[PDB]
């Protein structure tokens, strides 16, 4: 939604340049002396042409043929709601008469840009007789840049990997979200490593990850 | 009454004037006034027989009546404030006594909607909540595809650099494979006619090979693809110039506004002949009336040049001055020189005010607007074979355009002709 009522105005009443807002993710536009808003989501592009003295703008919206290659296909925000209604495709402008354009196409090219995660069930930490435990274990992909060592356990329905050695931030790992558990030791290679597999990827650290990866090196080159 | 000079009407326009009464509503545009002393308006009248109905609100723009009536005419209007409200309906609850709700037709902006083609308007209800309806008298040409995809152009008559505002060329819009219906409606107005064709002559943009021929007062251009139409107001210059090899002339006409697919763009109709290209036209015209029609300056029946034919024929029907090609030879007694462009190779030919680089994308550099050109160069054995630079600004459009692969001879030959013309070169 742009607006809800009638209360909130645009920035200005009298509109005579082309508005951008940003507050509520939505632009107005006049066809000919009257508004409209839409939406960022229902943006595609735009573009530009100078010719002579006389310029041409052309903006661009989420519509069939425009935002999916090929039409009657399944998208989320046109398509889904309704399959077969009218949308609107493109438009254009020409605003030689004021030297204030430039500026609106820039805000509307930062504007399209200007705007995650299927989460999983807790995983229950149990300390139990039986606890698994080893050390100098690194995760890949790491929380951040720098590289993280840390100990790995198993408990009974997925896989926590805890961190207080260095930070203390809690990582888990739903056992039916694994998919596939391998070892690789380092026969002719250079770490020991444990690979887990999900189907259903988790966000972590900094980033989205599917693959998480647990091993200790076994370098011997040193430059000592 | 009451009399306010500050009110709006036509956005795309400038203010206007109201004088309320009784009968009806009165409205003047804004007097223009020539030599303080010729006076011009335009009034109308609207009585209250025409009123259908009101929705002014504060949810659109510029907070003022929004009227409907039975004389196919909407008025938009704006220009007036917020304590308007009393007033105006103090006015209006003596007769017409209809309440004006708080519509706000239309703000959710999504692009679901449906659209019926109206009496003479198209309104857009997202599901029951109008978004827009635009009167049919401010359509210009509407285009129509095989998707049923639709492209409504619009030639809006601009006045001076200040009033004119906001202002659109085109609402364009997809239709579904609507069974059995078609855009019937749209197309109700006017192209609007009655003296000479060509067949089968050969154009570049677009790119094809068709015929084009001429009515009282403009072309129709047209083709087994498509037809296009071009006025003569829209014209403004025309220029012929010929080939490095002499074998080909191109006939330039650089018109404004372009004409557009609904998203191409052609400056600038490039024309190409033959040397060849000798033969004789006949004039569609009374052996009397063509005096008044040409000016006396072009026969009923002549043969000559098929191009010169046209040139003049043009120049006779814009009334301005045409262009020569210059008398500077380039190298090898050759009238251009040819360079890299876009990753394509085309000529530059001066002229008595401007440069004009052909032909993808067929490029004005007038003399006049041309800043300063500077001249980047690099020390190598290669040198001698097309490798000097030449760096053009134009300040009146910020626009800098660098000219690569020039050799000596032609760099020698093009800074002789600009210490004559005495531009200003930088180094």
């Known amino acids: 939604e742009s607006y809800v009522r009638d209360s909130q105005l645009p920035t200005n ?3 005579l340049r082309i508005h951008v807002d940003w507050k509520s993710q939505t ?8 508004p409209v808003p839409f939406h960022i989501n229902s943006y595609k592009n735009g573009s530009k042409n100078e010719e002579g003295e006389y310029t041409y703008l052309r903006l661009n919206f989420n519509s069939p043929g425009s935002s999916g290659g090929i039409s009657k296909k399944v998208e989320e925000l046109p398509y ?3 399959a077969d209604n009218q949308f609107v495709r493109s438009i254009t402008l020409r605003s030689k008469d004021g030297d204030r354009m430039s500026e609106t196409f820039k805000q509307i090219a930062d504007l399209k840009k200007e705007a995650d995660v299927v989460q999983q069930d807790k995983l229950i930490e149990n300390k139990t007789g039986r606890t698994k435990r080893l050390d100098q274990i690194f995760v890949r992909p790491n929380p951040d840049t720098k590289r993280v060592p840390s100990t790995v356990f198993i408990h009974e329905n997925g896989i926590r990997f805890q961190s207080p050695l260095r930070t203390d931030s809690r990582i888990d790992i739903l056992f039916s979200n694994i998919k596939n558990l391998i070892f690789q030791s380092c026969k002719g290679e250079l770490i020991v490593v444990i690979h887990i597999h999900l189907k259903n990827p988790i966000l972590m650290g900094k980033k989205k990850i599917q693959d998480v990866q647990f091993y200790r090196e076994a370098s011997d080159m040193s430059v000592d | 009454s009451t009399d306010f000079d500050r009110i709006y009407l036509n956005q795309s326009k400038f203010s206007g004037r109201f004088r309320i009464a009784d009968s009806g509503l009165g409205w003047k545009i804004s007097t223009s006034g020539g030599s303080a002393a010729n006076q011009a308006r335009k009034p109308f009248l609207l009585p209250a027989t025409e009123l259908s109905t009101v929705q002014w609100s504060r949810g659109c723009r510029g907070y003022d009546l929004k009227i409907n009536t039975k004389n196919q005419g909407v008025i938009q209007l704006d220009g007036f404030s917020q304590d308007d409200y009393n007033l105006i ?6 007769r017409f006594n209809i309440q004006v709700e708080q519509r706000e037709h239309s703000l959710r902006g999504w692009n679901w909607g449906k659209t019926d083609l109206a009496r003479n308007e198209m309104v857009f209800a997202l599901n029951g909540k109008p978004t827009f309806e635009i009167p049919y008298a401010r359509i210009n040409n509407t285009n129509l ?3 049923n995809e639709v ?3 619009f030639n809006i008559q601009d006045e001076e650099y200040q009033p004119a505002g906001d202002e659109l060329v085109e609402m364009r819009f997809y239709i579904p494979g609507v069974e059995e219906l078609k855009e019937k409606a749209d197309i109700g107005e006017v192209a609007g006619d009655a003296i ?8 570049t943009t677009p790119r094809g090979r068709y015929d084009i021929d001429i009515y009282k007062n403009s072309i129709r251009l047209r083709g087994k693809t498509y037809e296009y139409k071009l006025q003569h107001r829209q014209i403004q210059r025309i220029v012929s110039l010929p080939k490095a090899d002499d074998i080909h002339h191109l006939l330039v006409l650089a018109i404004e506004p372009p004409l557009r697919q609904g998203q191409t763009t052609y400056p600038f109709l490039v024309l190409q002949f033959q040397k060849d290209e000798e033969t004789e036209v006949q004039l569609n015209l009374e052996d009397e009336d063509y005096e008044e029609n040409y000016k ?6 002549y043969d000559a040049k098929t191009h010169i034919v046209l040139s003049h024929v043009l120049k006779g029907l814009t009334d301005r001055r045409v262009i020569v090609p210059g008398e500077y030879k380039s190298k090898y007694d050759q009238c251009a020189v040819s360079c890299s462009f876009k990753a394509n190779e085309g000529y530059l030919y001066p002229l008595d005010n401007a440069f004009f680089f052909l032909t993808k994308p067929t490029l004005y550099i007038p003399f006049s607007d041309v800043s300063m050109v500077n001249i980047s160069r690099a020390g190598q054995t290669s040198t001698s074979s097309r490798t000097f630079d030449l760096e053009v600004v134009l300040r009146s459009n910020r626009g800098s355009t660098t000219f690569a692969n020039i050799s000596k001879e032609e760099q020698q030959l093009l800074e002789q002709f600009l210490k004559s013309k005495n531009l200003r070169v930088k180094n």
């Open chain 2, 296 to 301: 006396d300056k072009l026969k009923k029946q």
């Open chain 2, 151 to 153: 492209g409504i152009e």
């Open chain 2, 145 to 147: 595809t095989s998707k």
């Open chain 1, 27 to 34: 632009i107005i536009l006049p066809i000919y002396g009257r």
């Open chain 1, 80 to 82: 889904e709601e309704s």
């Open chain 1, 13 to 15: 009443i009298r509109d």
């Open chain 2, 196 to 203: 000479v064709s060509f067949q089968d002559v050969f154009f």
């Open chain 2, 89 to 94: 309906k103090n006015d209006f609850h003596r």
